[PDB]
Design a protein around this ligand. Structure first.
Ligand SMILES: [Mg+2]
Ligand SMILES: [Mg+2]
Ligand SMILES: [Mg+2]
Ligand SMILES: [Mg+2]
Ligand SMILES: [Mg+2]
Ligand SMILES: [Mg+2]
Ligand SMILES: [Mg+2]
Ligand SMILES: [Mg+2]
Ligand SMILES: [Mg+2]
Ligand SMILES: [Mg+2]
Ligand SMILES: [Mg+2]
Ligand SMILES: [Mg+2]
Ligand SMILES: [Mg+2]
Ligand SMILES: [Mg+2]
Ligand SMILES: [Mg+2]
Ligand SMILES: [Mg+2]
Ligand SMILES: [Mg+2]
Ligand SMILES: [Mg+2]
Ligand SMILES: [Mg+2]
Ligand SMILES: [Mg+2]
Ligand SMILES: [Mg+2]
Ligand SMILES: [Mg+2]
Ligand SMILES: [Mg+2]
Ligand SMILES: [Mg+2]
Ligand SMILES: [Mg+2]
Ligand SMILES: [Mg+2]
Ligand SMILES: [Mg+2]
Ligand SMILES: [Mg+2]
Ligand SMILES: [Mg+2]
Ligand SMILES: [Mg+2]
Ligand SMILES: [Mg+2]
Ligand SMILES: [Mg+2]
Ligand SMILES: [Mg+2]
Ligand SMILES: [Mg+2]
Ligand SMILES: [Mg+2]
Ligand SMILES: [Mg+2]
Ligand SMILES: [Zn+2]
Lengths: 155, 206, 97, 116, 127, 83, 60, 23
RNA sequence: CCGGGCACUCUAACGGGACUGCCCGCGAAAGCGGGAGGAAGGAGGGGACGACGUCUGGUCAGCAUGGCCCUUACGGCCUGGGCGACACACGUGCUACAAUGCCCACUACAAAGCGAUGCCACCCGGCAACGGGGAGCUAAUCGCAAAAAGGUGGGCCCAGUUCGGAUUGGGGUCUGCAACCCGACCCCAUGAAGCCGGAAUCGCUAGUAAUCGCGGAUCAGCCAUGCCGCGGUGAAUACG
């Protein structure tokens, strides 16, 4: 807000992987403050991304995450009388947030019926470079590229 | 109009109740009702005397009414006369052991509702309201008081345009709870309508 | 010997719960100490002003505290001196066996 | 149009399939499965013709269904409307019968809004 | 013989007893994993002992009252951490950087008049 | 509605007036203020003027209208439509 | 329609359902607390005065 | 289905009992 | 459960404890940044608390009150009706549109309160609303009372559906003199709109939002999905 830069909340590490990054992904799945249900679905996905592909879920998950991180985004700023889509770098804190949110949102677009499955399948295709989350990243990345001419309007 | 009643803000802190007793669920209403009729009876009669507080205590089917007043004689009567004369009328309505005492008022100018009633009475007598308040605050502070504030509201002097006039001196910390402040209010009926008088006296901070 | 103390005021309840336990522990013999029973609270919610103004309320409450004391080794050495005990007005007392 | 005048949905469990008949809810469905001794969890595409003809015969004889049930509901309202009772007025102006407010809402009895 | 600490969380309170053995754990007359089955957060109640590598050195007979399952879990996490500094006062280190020594005072905030909850204000529309 | 454990409700003062007419030779108009009263098998054939707050409605009683109240057949609200 | 009502409230009804609490102080038909016999308006008036045993402003 | 009286959840919401939520 | 014990937990009163007190650093001071100790650190979180005044704000309908008005009535009493109307229009809400779901069964963990023509354990008749009995308790004893989400399991398989519960038919329960207008509740049948909402627009910064149940006042009963409270689970984000 106005006064001072607020403090970032560090999440209590997950009990299956001891990972602060995994905890975040969990919370974005959490509807209605029902974390336990969100815990299953994600861990269930760890089960699924093991069966349909014999390797470490944490390795699947984390690599999938990196492939969704946008390095450049466009933030609107109506200078003069027109709305300019100013290109901006994305801080790692936001790169994390946007990748995770999109990753879960991309999951909820898929046609597979169980939540456990979708999370797996998106995380599966994400590390392999596909999936709606990576589609959104590439989009937002080209938009900032397209508007490279407004580099001098950056804050 | 935003300020809180300064009495209820201090109950159990700097000010003590005026009906001190326990009662279960099924009797509270009936006992309180009598406490209203009794106050109703006395405050009606004892204005002449200069009523300051009507304390009430209870045990079983009996009640001690400790009545503070500046003129004990108007309460006492001729030799002990009136003090009992009411006690029969009192116990007529009460129908029980009415222990009707009379307590001294050390300084009547350090009694808020007394100061109020006085001023309210004065303005029923066409008295200079601007003056009247300035005097009461002046008399209260001479009585060694630590603070004083007096407010009069309504058709002051008979003017069709209503006006709220006030005066204060020393300290009157209404935001403090440890600050002991007496408050009293009196209604001044006239030919042109109701006038309201409030009194704020700051005795001392405990 | 079951003395139960009910009152709107605990400063008088605990003060009287002193005077009671003091007397029978003096005049023999055993009194099981003053236990502070949980207080029963009757809260009232009221609209501040007389007309409309719904979203402005004031909070009131009525706190009937409770105390309990026992006399373990009774004996009528106490049964008359307790019968002569200066009880405040804001308190109700019960006796049992 | 197997039973009872309606052809109940195949590939669905026999208990729910009966609810697609006018006159039968889940309740009368739980009933006819004991009273005929048929497994509620099996599909209708898996019903024995024996199990069929029994469930059919029972249900058509124990309860009033389709057109007849619709007939009495109609007959019940027709009279209420004709005697001139309040219940009849509300059926004749198409307004809510069960004492609801009519200042707002009531959209199911009236139909879509006719603005002004 | 016995090592004790009081653990509390919101409305939950935990009395916990650490007594050496094979590593058994019991909560309210029930086995730990039995009273906390299907809750992932339960593995965090056994957290402080892992900060001092005493996983199976102590057993635990624990009761718990008030609050909820995960509230009760944090109370447990506090009392078994409490009990360690009584068994080993030199265990203050490597248990406080993990902050296990402290009790988080965050409780359900009061519902206010004029709001639907503690802060959720009723929706409004001027013109 | 009214519990079957209790009785079929007529105001009695009206039920009285009905029976007296059946004996002495029916029938004339009945001014009543009992909308809460149940129509009853003895009331059949008469014509009872039921007050709705403003006027008494001339109501012929038949067989098909037995279980209802007298008030259902005397409308309380005036309404001819909108606009 | 006030004084004939504050007196109609006192007398016993023809049926028990017709019993309704009025404020024993001012006669207010609405918001009447059984425990005091008072309406929320009078309740707040006396409680501030201190003329209500034990009754004090709540805070938590 | 906090509004459907013919369910467990529905009678909970109403605060009532019956065949579908017995005691 | 009994002996026993007050340890613990609690209960409810009285105290302690936080003061930038202490180290490093920047400072003219006040302070600010960081460290330690410590349950808590820089107002620890919430409440109570609202300056002179503003709005000729609201309230003659809670009450008071000047004055103006009515007098077989503009007073008063009663029966019925209305305040619940309905071509429509707005605000605040409830329940939804479903698979992070819905249903059935079994199994857990709260807090605050209330309760003598009052709460009603248990028992038996009814699918049930309930009804008959009947134990206890002026209640840290007895009861409302099950917390619900959660948990183990089984069903449903993407369909206007086992989603959704409106509307209507019918049979009943309860209160109350009396449920036509015009009560709630129960059971069978009926199973509407609704596939996430145009322009527009509201709230919330941490135990918060979201979501789940629970109690109280008023009150015969109840149109409470309202209000005032209480715990359970429990986020995202603040560049500026
Ligand atoms: Mg996206
Ligand atoms: Mg509101
Ligand atoms: Mg059907
Ligand atoms: Mg209705
Ligand atoms: Mg209507
Ligand atoms: Mg487990
Ligand atoms: Mg809450
Ligand atoms: Mg508004
Ligand atoms: Mg009149
Ligand atoms: Mg009057
Ligand atoms: Mg009534
Ligand atoms: Mg009332
Ligand atoms: Mg349903
Ligand atoms: Mg002790
Ligand atoms: Mg600071
Ligand atoms: Mg302050
Ligand atoms: Mg004006
Ligand atoms: Mg008036
Ligand atoms: Mg006037
Ligand atoms: Mg009416
Ligand atoms: Mg109205
Ligand atoms: Mg609503
Ligand atoms: Mg909603
Ligand atoms: Mg359909
Ligand atoms: Mg449709
Ligand atoms: Mg359906
Ligand atoms: Mg019907
Ligand atoms: Mg009705
Ligand atoms: Mg669909
Ligand atoms: Mg939704
Ligand atoms: Mg919408
Ligand atoms: Mg804020
Ligand atoms: Mg829900
Ligand atoms: Mg509720
Ligand atoms: Mg209640
Ligand atoms: Mg009620
Ligand atoms: Zn009143």
């Amino acid at each position: 807000a106005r006064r001072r830069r607020a403090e970032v909340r560090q999440l209590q590490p997950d009990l299956v992987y001891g990972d602060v990054l995994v905890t975040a992904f969990i919370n974005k799945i959490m509807r209605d403050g029902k974390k336990n249900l969100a815990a299953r679905i994600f861990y269930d996905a760890c089960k699924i991304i093991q069966e349909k592909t014999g390797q470490e879920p944490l390795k699947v998950f984390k690599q999938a995450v990196e492939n969704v991180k946008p390095r450049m985004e466009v933030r609107s700023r109506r200078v003069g009388g027109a709305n300019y889509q100013v290109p901006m770098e994305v801080s790692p804190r936001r790169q994390q947030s946007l990748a995770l949110r999109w990753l879960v949102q991309a999951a909820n677009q898929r046609p597979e019926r169980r939540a456990a499955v979708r999370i797996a399948h998106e995380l599966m295709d994400a590390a392999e470079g596909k999936g709606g989350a990576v589609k959104k990243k590439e989009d937002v990345e080209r938009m900032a590229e397209a508007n490279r001419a407004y580099a001098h309007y950056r804050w | 109009g935003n300020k809180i009643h300064p009495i209820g803000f201090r109950l159990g802190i700097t000010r003590d109740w005026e009906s001190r007793w326990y009662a279960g669920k099924k009797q509270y209403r009936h006992l309180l009702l009598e406490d209203q009729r009794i106050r109703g009876l006395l405050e009606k009669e004892l204005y002449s005397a200069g009523l300051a507080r009507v304390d009430i205590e209870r045990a079983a089917d009996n009640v001690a009414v400790t009545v503070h007043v500046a003129k004990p004689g108007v309460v006492i009567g001729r030799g002990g006369e009136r003090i009992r004369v009411l006690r029969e009328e009192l116990a007529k309505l009460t129908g029980k052991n009415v222990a009707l005492n009379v307590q001294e008022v050390q300084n009547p100018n350090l009694s808020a509702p007394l100061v109020a009633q006085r001023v309210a009475e004065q303005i029923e007598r066409r008295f200079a309201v601007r003056r009247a308040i300035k005097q009461a605050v002046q008399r209260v502070m001479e009585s060694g008081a630590k603070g004083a504030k007096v407010i009069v509201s309504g058709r002051i002097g008979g003017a069709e345009q209503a006006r709220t006039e006030w005066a204060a001196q020393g300290r009157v910390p209404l935001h403090t709870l440890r600050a002991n402040i007496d408050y009293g209010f009196a209604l001044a009926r006239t030919t042109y309508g109701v006038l309201g008088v409030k009194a704020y006296i700051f005795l001392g901070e405990v | 010997i079951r003395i139960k103390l009910r009152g709107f005021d605990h400063k008088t309840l605990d003060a009287s719960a002193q005077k009671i336990v003091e007397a029978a522990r003096r005049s023999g013999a055993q009194v099981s100490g003053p236990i502070p029973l949980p207080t029963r609270v009757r809260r009232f919610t009221v609209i501040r002003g007389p007309f409309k103004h719904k979203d402005s309320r004031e909070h009131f409450e009525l706190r009937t505290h409770n105390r309990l004391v026992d006399i373990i080794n009774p004996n009528r050495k106490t049964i008359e001196q307790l019968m002569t005990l200066d009880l405040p007005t804001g308190v109700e007392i019960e006796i049992k066996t | 149009a197997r039973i009872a005048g309606v052809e109940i949905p195949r590939n669905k469990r026999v208990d729910v399939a009966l609810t697609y008949i006018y006159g039968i809810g889940k309740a009368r469905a739980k009933e006819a499965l004991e009273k005929t001794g048929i497994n509620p969890a099996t599909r209708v595409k898996d019903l024995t013709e024996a199990e069929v003809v029994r469930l059919r015969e029972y249900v058509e004889n124990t309860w009033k269904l389709e057109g007849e049930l619709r007939a009495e509901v109609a007959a019940n309202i027709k009279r209420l409307m004709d005697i001139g009772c309040y219940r009849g007025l509300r059926h004749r102006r198409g307004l809510p019968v069960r004492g609801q407010r009519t200042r707002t809402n009531a959209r199911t009895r009236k139909g879509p809004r006719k603005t002004v | 013989e016995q090592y004790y600490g009081t653990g509390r969380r919101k409305e939950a309170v935990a009395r916990v007893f650490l007594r050496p053995g094979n590593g058994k754990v019991t909560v309210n007359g029930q086995d730990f994993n039995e009273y906390f089955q299907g809750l992932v957060r339960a593995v965090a109640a056994l957290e402080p002992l892992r900060a001092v590598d005493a996983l199976g050195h102590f057993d635990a007979y624990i009761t718990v009252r008030g609050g909820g399952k995960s509230g009760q879990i944090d109370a447990i996490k506090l009392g078994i951490a409490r009990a360690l500094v009584q068994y080993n006062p030199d265990y203050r280190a490597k248990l406080k950087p993990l902050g296990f020594l402290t009790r988080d005072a965050r409780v359900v905030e009061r519902k206010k008049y004029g709001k639907h909850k503690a802060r959720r204000a009723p929706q409004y529309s001027k013109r | 509605p009214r519990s079957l454990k209790k009785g079929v409700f007529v105001d009695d003062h009206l039920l009285e007036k009905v029976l007296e007419l059946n004996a002495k030779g029916e029938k004339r108009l009945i001014k009543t203020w009992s909308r809460r009263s149940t129509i009853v098998p003895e009331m059949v054939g008469h014509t009872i003027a039921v007050y709705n707050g403003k006027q008494h409605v001339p109501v012929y009683i038949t067989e098909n209208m037995v279980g209802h109240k007298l008030g259902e057949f005397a409308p309380t609200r005036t309404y001819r439509g909108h606009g | 329609a006030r004084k004939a009502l504050i007196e109609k409230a006192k007398r016993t009804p023809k049926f028990k359902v017709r019993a309704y609490t009025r404020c024993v102080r001012c006669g207010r038909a609405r918001s009447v607390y059984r425990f005091f016999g008072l309406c929320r308006i009078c309740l707040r008036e006396l409680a501030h005065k201190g003329q209500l045993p034990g009754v004090r402003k709540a805070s938590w | 289905g906090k509004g459907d009286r013919r369910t467990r959840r529905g009678k909970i919401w109403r605060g009532t009992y019956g065949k579908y939520r017995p005691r």
